[PDB]
Design a protein around this ligand. Structure first.
Ligand SMILES: Nc1ncnc2c1ncn2[C@@H]1O[C@H](COS(=O)(=O)NC(=O)[C@@H](N)CS)[C@@H](O)[C@H]1O
Length: 157
């Protein structure tokens, strides 16, 4: 059913012990946080954007709520060294997925991660499932368990 990249994310959820979480590849786009929320009837804040930044020693994953903008200054202080937004080419090289479908798991390398503390305000959130049509629902606590992320104030607001 699922396209390869979506199947890759579903396989990662299964491998990590969260096989009860299901990737869906929908009849409406989920490319942007706005479209993803409309596709599943969620508030945009419940959508998880998985953003990749490149640092001096490696890359980092920032899981940001769809209602927030990642503050590069805050991210830089958290990592403790310079950071720059990954180009679409670097996103593909690093994660195995392309912009619009970057998931929080299943990458070529598990990236140290940070979770936007506002995601903890929702009982369930939806993260990308590997493609611009794929999402999976999970509780914020399950997302933390899946990524090992550290909770942080990431937003510009
Ligand atoms: N040209 C680009 N170069 C680098 N980053 C980009 C580019 N275009 C978009 N992005 C980044 O990728 C983000 C879009 O991916 S996202 O926020 O994680 N959202 C999604 O993947 C949706 N599927 C909802 S789950 C944009 O908000 C932006 O931070």
């Amino acid at each position: 059913s699922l396209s390869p990249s979506a199947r890759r994310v579903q396989g990662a959820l299964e491998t990590r012990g969260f096989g009860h979480l299901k990737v869906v590849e929908l009849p409406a786009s989920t490319r942007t946080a706005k479209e993803a929320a409309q596709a599943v009837g969620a508030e945009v804040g419940q959508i998880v954007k998985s953003l990749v930044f490149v640092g001096e020693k490696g890359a980092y994953l920032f899981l940001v709520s769809g209602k927030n903008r990642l503050d590069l200054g805050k991210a830089t202080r958290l990592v403790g060294g310079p950071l720059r937004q990954a180009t679409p080419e670097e996103v593909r090289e690093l994660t195995g997925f392309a912009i619009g479908g970057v998931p929080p798991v299943g990458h070529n390398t598990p990236l140290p991660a940070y979770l936007d503390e506002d995601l903890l305000g929702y009982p369930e959130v939806w993260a990308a499932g590997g493609t611009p049509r794929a999402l999976f629902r999970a509780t914020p606590k399950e997302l933390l368990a899946l990524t090992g992320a550290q909770v942080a104030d990431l937003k510009e607001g």
